């Protein structure tokens, strides 16, 4: 017989400080009424935020995910949790009469998160090509996923979590594999399709705050 | 890279000098002749940590094979079992470099 | 084989007096003779070790659980059975587990359990086609066989 929506407070959620826009939106929590804590039932919340509403002029077919970790009061602070690829894009990129290449590898950064990274690469039809197939071999595939496993670890073993984001806001890896695999067989549609965090470290409090200035 | 272990020991049994056993290769470590010592993964725990002290005193590499000493018997071609292989003279093999 | 499950002699270094306490256990599957069995709460996780219920992860096959945080072993200790740890709960300090009957039960996450199934499995086969070979079975423990 009572409306329970006046028993709530709206909070805000922020981003780390290598992006542009800080605000994401508002998320209501119950008051701390007796035992249950409004910081507690809000802290474990995940925000699916597309990158073109986090930047000014970048692509829109990439998404990030941001959990919450700490309560400041009308302020949640967020950390990187993973990256997704839109079903618009991936299904608008897989088409017949071309060859699909996938890969996946695990890596631990210098402070430790156990990132799992996936990838994909499609072969490109040439300019004057009249042969319809444009298939690859199998030894040229295995000599391609050897390079993608060499590169994701090589770009990741020697830095922290703050700088691989700056190596994922552009397409700097897909550019690199496209130009270090153009020698064997010319591929055009290269992405890292999912980055997943496995095992987060100890909750040190102000490495985040360093990520908020 | 098991093929770079088994195919070399194929050549060593024809080419150069080998000594198999324990009492015979502790005489042959003590007398300053051995150059490479192989152990299988069921030499119990101890003589594993004793051969690594004679070879501590002679500066000789000790390699650990993957399987047991039945596989190591077959890999040496013979029909019995063997725990401790010691290679003195390779001859025409390149086992010492890997 | 008074009853049909194998035991184990485990000898501990007792840190109070100068003496060696002996014990007994129920042998899990694949125990050597000469095998350093550790025992405690900071104990690493392999077979023979015995460590509390609250720390092991989910879906781990255990045996000889204590229904109460200490009573020196009362569950799932027969020839070839195993309980499974289902979940946890950080507040109220409890932990669910499924028994070999099929039922489920809530146990406080402070008791102890060895890791691994009970050695001696597959006993219910080999039908006793003889009669007095069940007779030498129940000449042991007790007297109720000729129903």
């Amino acid at each position: 017989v009572v409306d329970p929506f006046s028993k709530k407070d709206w909070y805000d959620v922020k981003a780390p400080a290598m992006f542009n826009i800080r605000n994401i939106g508002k998320t209501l929590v119950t008051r701390t009424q007796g035992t249950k804590i409004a910081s507690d039932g809000l802290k474990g919340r995940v925000f699916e935020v597309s990158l073109a509403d986090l930047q000014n002029d970048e692509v829109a077919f990439r998404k990030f995910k941001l959990i919450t970790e700490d309560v400041q009061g009308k302020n949640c602070l967020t950390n990187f949790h993973g990256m997704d690829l839109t079903r618009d894009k991936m299904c608008s990129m897989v088409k017949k009469w071309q060859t699909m290449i996938e890969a996946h590898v695990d890596v631990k950064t210098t402070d430790g998160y156990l990132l799992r990274l996936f990838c994909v690469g499609f072969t490109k039809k040439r300019n004057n090509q009249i042969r319809k197939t444009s298939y690859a071999q199998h030894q040229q595939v295995r000599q391609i996923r050897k390079k993608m496993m060499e590169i994701m670890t090589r770009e990741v073993q020697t830095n922290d979590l703050k700088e691989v984001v700056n190596k994922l806001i552009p397409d700097s890896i897909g550019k690199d594999i496209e130009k270090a695999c153009q020698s064997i067989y010319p591929l055009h549609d290269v992405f890292v399709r999912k980055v997943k965090m496995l095992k987060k470290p100890k909750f040190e409090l102000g490495k985040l705050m360093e990520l908020h200035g | 890279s098991l093929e770079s272990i088994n195919s070399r020991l194929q050549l060593v049994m024809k080419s150069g000098k080998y000594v198999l056993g324990y009492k015979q290769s502790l005489k042959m470590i003590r007398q300053g002749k051995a150059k490479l010592v192989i152990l299988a993964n069921n030499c119990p725990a101890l003589r594993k940590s004793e051969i690594e002290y004679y070879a501590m005193l002679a500066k000789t590499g000790v390699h650990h094979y993957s399987g047991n000493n039945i596989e190591l018997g077959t890999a040496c071609g013979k029909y019995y079992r063997v725990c401790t292989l010691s290679i003195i003279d390779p001859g025409d093999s390149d086992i010492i470099r890997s | 084989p008074g009853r049909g499950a194998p035991l184990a002699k485990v000898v501990f270094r007792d840190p109070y007096r100068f003496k060696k306490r002996t014990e007994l256990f129920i042998a899990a599957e694949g125990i050597h003779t000469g095998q350093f069995v550790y025992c405690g709460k900071k104990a690493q996780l392999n077979i023979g070790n015995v460590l509390p219920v609250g720390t092991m992860p989910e879906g781990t096959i255990v045996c000889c659980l204590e229904e109460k945080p200490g009573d020196r072993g009362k569950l799932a200790r027969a020839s070839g059975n195993y309980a499974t740890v289902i979940s946890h709960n950080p507040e109220t300090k409890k932990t669910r587990v499924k028994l070999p009957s099929g039922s489920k039960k809530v146990i406080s996450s402070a008791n102890r359990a060895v890791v691994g199934v009970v050695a001696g499995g597959g006993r219910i086969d080999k039908p006793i086609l003889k009669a007095g070979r069940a007779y030498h079975k129940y000449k042991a423990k007790r007297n109720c066989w000729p129903r």
Binding site: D106 | - | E29, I31, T33, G34, P57, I61, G120, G121, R123
Partner: protein, 91 residues
Amino acid sequence: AKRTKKVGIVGKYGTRYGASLRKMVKKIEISQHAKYTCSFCGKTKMKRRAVGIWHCGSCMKTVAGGAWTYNTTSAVTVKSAIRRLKELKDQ
């Protein structure tokens, strides 16, 4: 010079005990008296002194194993799932 043509070991019973009770048992009569290879030495293992209590005789090293074999069916997929949870916390 074979002389039994199917009954094998269980030919010691005879006309007794039925038929598929002398066929369900041939395997679980053969596979307890056999001499396995050890894990530390060679080929002297048939002395199951009792149920679940397999025993050597050159290495002199008793193993508390299965009740009719050396290994069971379940406890090998168990030892693999225990080594999996053991390296799944550390990596």
